[PDB]
Subunit: 248 residues, 4 copies
């Protein structure tokens, strides 16, 4: 029987490359999405064309609310409904936008802390309660201690995510569930960003003056789920080309 | 005129010691409280006995909800309305209890993440919007070696580190410094003495917990003129506890 | 055709396991040793039987002295002599013993700082001067929670972190990646008490080597300045 | 009696501000120096005219060698000879210069950069503890230790080791009541020979005020860690850099 994996925010960009490589490695995949229905269904088709009955989609909004836990429970239940098991959780979905200290503020809190941290915690709980090489990989941020100006809520959410990574590694280790992270520095840059600003960020990177490809982020995820990382838990692998080492 | 400070969860234990020492240094104080009205008021009366009209109380729940922004805005506003200014914010209030991965879960989230992180964020934003100005957040020296089954608490304290760092950077252009004090084991909970002694015995420096006053002293330093170039720093005050391997 | 790797302290335990796995991935290897000549040779023999002229040995003391730079330069030179190239440097050799604050002390400095930090710096220098290129330093997952009375060893592994980060920055323009692997308790009733603290299964060399193999691979081409803990969660356990 | 402190590299700049501030708080001080004999004596003179028999000087080269342990033992012994006690050690002396990976011999660069920044602190810590109240040790660390300057690998290594020593010695000396902490500047007094334009490049990076720390600001954090207001603090490193370490590339 092939193992199965949930990848959140898997319709595009890094989550898609993660889903692809997991599927190329032998996994069946739940492709979670919020608004990108076309791209999600289109990816599941591409994957099912390669091996039938190996990909489903699952829509959920990952904003914090009093029904977020039932949404998270549903994401994990969909893996067990499609495949009869759930071996890997990848917490990849993320909101990312400025929240200057000087959308209502309670929506910003619900989006940036819900998606980046609370949803991973609830997915983790549902993943653990429903339970072999079981593991969780959280998508962290290499720059979490050198934050972007005016991104306090985002940064808080990614700090919380490190805390979860550690806390869940400790508490879940006696059930055989490993919990780790992968921390991009700059990888695929925002759709909305202009070409001058992208090159400003690209020239800061010591290793090659370029962003990480999505595939490079995925390769680290593939490592942490593999049999070659079976003692690794509570570790966060930076994949940023040295960017976090560069002083102001 | 005397400067003014808000201290959250100031009725008892560490927040009380903080409020007292700020008052001793010449601060006027807003004593924020949630359920401990009697202790908050008894503190404000003692402080006002030392110096008239120097202490007020402000009740608010710091649990995350759609009224939290208005509550935090009101706490800052109460310092301005009482004293004409707000020089210092101490984010001390904290919920602390286990949340095993294996009250509803969304209440746990609102309490643990609200008090420890979202309320500090909202307070920080209101403090800055309304302007030796500084903020001090009460962090946790053990944030990278967390207690088993305290995932939400740990996430809240991690978020608080992120706030400390993010606000320090963003508020440095306004002359507002943002720092933290990270206790290890300080005043312990009704916890049996035999259980207290198991924690005390792990502390290299003296085999004892920090007093509240010892934590307050680091807060006093960070708000002082002796720390005018210090921002984005977190001072551990654990007796070496975080250095001790399993 | 085939890439080549230098592994220090490669005769036994973790370094052997690293050398074996690199060789199994298609590397030619320099097996460095200090006192374990028989074990280095026996390893080289097992590897060369698998594929002829793919494994050589190099003796060198990695204690800091006036001669250490020459020794380090020759380790790298042996890789170039045997194989025509040097793609990977694994700094694995390490001295480990207590040095209470309360052998002369300067000999302790020379071994614990020399082997753990200065020889890695000289090796890294020689390696870069001679040029998928990468260096992997064997770090410590417990560097922040150090063993009681191990101050010099602890200084040496801290220094190795600083080297990892500094060399990642400075060599990145040359396409040389620099990373680390930090084991927890991979041992030299005391043994069983350490085993018992580990979250993940209360318990190999190969597990360390697996992480090294990842960091040298084409799957880590954007990773530099990263230290991968391989500790079963031990570094997360409070006192 | 008044307490006594040793401050290494105390003739000028931050070490001088630290000795001065400790002297202003009531300490008697050992002013260690290497080459700056004139500045050392001139400082001890001013302190002694403020209060007689309260400042001495002590010459030592802190480069690693087979005599370094004896030089470190002698520094500590100077304080006990002059003042009958030694309450505080401040490890402030530091060599600082590039050692590119791709003149001095390499073994001399190792001996100076690792010796002054890490080995001499370890040996001084050992002598301080063996020769033994609010006893403490403060190490001058570097706030930028994880975002290092390009081509400064041996300096960076030395400062990482010093973080290790701060932690290990805090752990091991706690049972004896000796606290060990650090203070970590970002950009404080710029190098004498750095030109103004270059200095201003560094200043402009600092979020809090776009200026370097004064030597006195660094010294304030030292004074705090040695005071009775830091009695439960050991193994902590306080950054004094105006936010510099938080600023991304
Ligand atoms: N790209 C980088 O440079 C970089 C740097 C550091 C860290 N990271 C982290 O690495 C991971 C992947 O990066 P990325 O650029 O691929 O992320 P991304 O494109 O910004 O977002 C990933 C997905 O998250 C989903 N999402 C956003 N808000 C959501 C909500 N309320 N509910 C559910 N899903 C929501 C979106 O799905 P739909 O499109 O279906 O709505 C989105 O496609 C993220 O966690 C990110 O923070 C990325
Ligand atoms: N004691 C320790 O060993 C230790 C260790 C690490 C970190 N810390 C941190 O140091 C700080 C002070 O510690 P402590 O032990 O003195 O704290 P505490 O006694 O646990 O709590 C401080 C105060 O927080 C307030 N609080 C709790 N939930 C609240 C809510 N929903 N809304 C508003 N206020 C709420 C309470 O106010 P009322 O009583 O008025 O309801 C309480 O008196 C905290 O941030 C704590 O996390 C302490
Ligand atoms: N085992 C663990 O649990 C653990 C934990 C933390 C970190 N690590 C690190 O992981 C790496 C490998 O660990 P390990 O237990 O396999 O190491 P180990 O067996 O203690 O030592 C590794 C090698 O270092 C060499 N060595 C020692 N002193 C030397 C000197 N003065 N000159 C030259 N070589 C010298 C030895 O060579 P000869 O036998 O040829 O003389 C030996 O083969 C080390 O860097 C270690 O510090 C290991
Ligand atoms: N300045 C900054 O921006 C900054 C930034 C980060 C960290 N720090 C740290 O803060 C501390 C003070 O900085 P600073 O700028 O005041 O230091 P500094 O002036 O560069 O050096 C301080 C003293 O160290 C002594 N020294 C150098 N090599 C020596 C040797 N081989 N033996 C004995 N002593 C030696 C010198 O004494 P003589 O003059 O008597 O020869 C020198 O006066 C240092 O540890 C430094 O690394 C400073
Ligand atoms: C200096 O710190 C940072 C730099 C760039 C980023 C990138 C920048 C970025 O491209 C990005 C994105 O497209 C999506 C996302 O969810 C998060 C992203 O973060 C994050 C940082 O914390
Ligand atoms: C993982 O190590 C830890 C040990 C003790 C504690 C103490 C234990 C403690 O007494 C305590 C408290 O009473 C209130 C509070 O808000 C936080 C508290 O934390 C926290 C840790 O994170
Ligand atoms: C509490 O911190 C630690 C505990 C054990 C270790 C292990 C203990 C260990 O088994 C070991 C070894 O066999 C060889 C070596 O070079 C280093 C070793 O370190 C390291 C620590 O930093
Ligand atoms: C990016 O990192 C750094 C930037 C500036 C510095 C300063 C720059 C500096 O002025 C300086 C000095 O004058 C003496 C000394 O011993 C160390 C010094 O370091 C250090 C860093 O590690």
């Amino acid at each position: 029987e092939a193992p199965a994996a949930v990848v959140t925010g898997a319709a595009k960009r890094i989550g898609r490359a993660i889903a692809v490589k997991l599927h190329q490695t032998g996994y069946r995949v739940v492709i979670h999405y919020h608004n990108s229905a076309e791209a999600a269904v289109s990816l599941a088709d591409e994957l099912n064309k390669e091996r039938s009955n190996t990909a489903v989609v699952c829509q959920a909004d990952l904003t914090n609310s009093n029904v977020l836990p039932a949404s998270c429970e549903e994401i994990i239940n969909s893996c067990f409904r499609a495949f009869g098991r759930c071996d890997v959780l990848v917490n990849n979905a993320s909101a990312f936008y400025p929240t200057p200290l000087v959308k209502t503020v309670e929506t910003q809190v619900a989006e940036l802390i819900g998606t980046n941290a609370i949803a991973p915690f609830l997915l983790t709980m549902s993943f653990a309660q429903r339970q072999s090489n079981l593991s969780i990989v959280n998508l962290c941020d290499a720059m979490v201690d050198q934050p972007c100006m005016a991104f306090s809520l985002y940064n808080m959410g990614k700090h919380a995510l490190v805390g979860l990574t550690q806390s869940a590694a400790l508490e879940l280790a006696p059930y055989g569930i490993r919990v780790n992270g992968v921390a991009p520095g700059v990888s695929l840059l925002p759709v909305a960003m202009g070409e001058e600003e992208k090159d400003k960020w690209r020239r800061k990177v010591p290793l090659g003056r370029r962003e990480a490809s999505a595939e490079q982020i995925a390769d680290a995820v593939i490592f942490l789920v593999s049999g070659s990382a079976q003692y690794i838990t509570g570790s966060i692998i930076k994949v940023d080309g040295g960017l976090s080492l560069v002083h102001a």
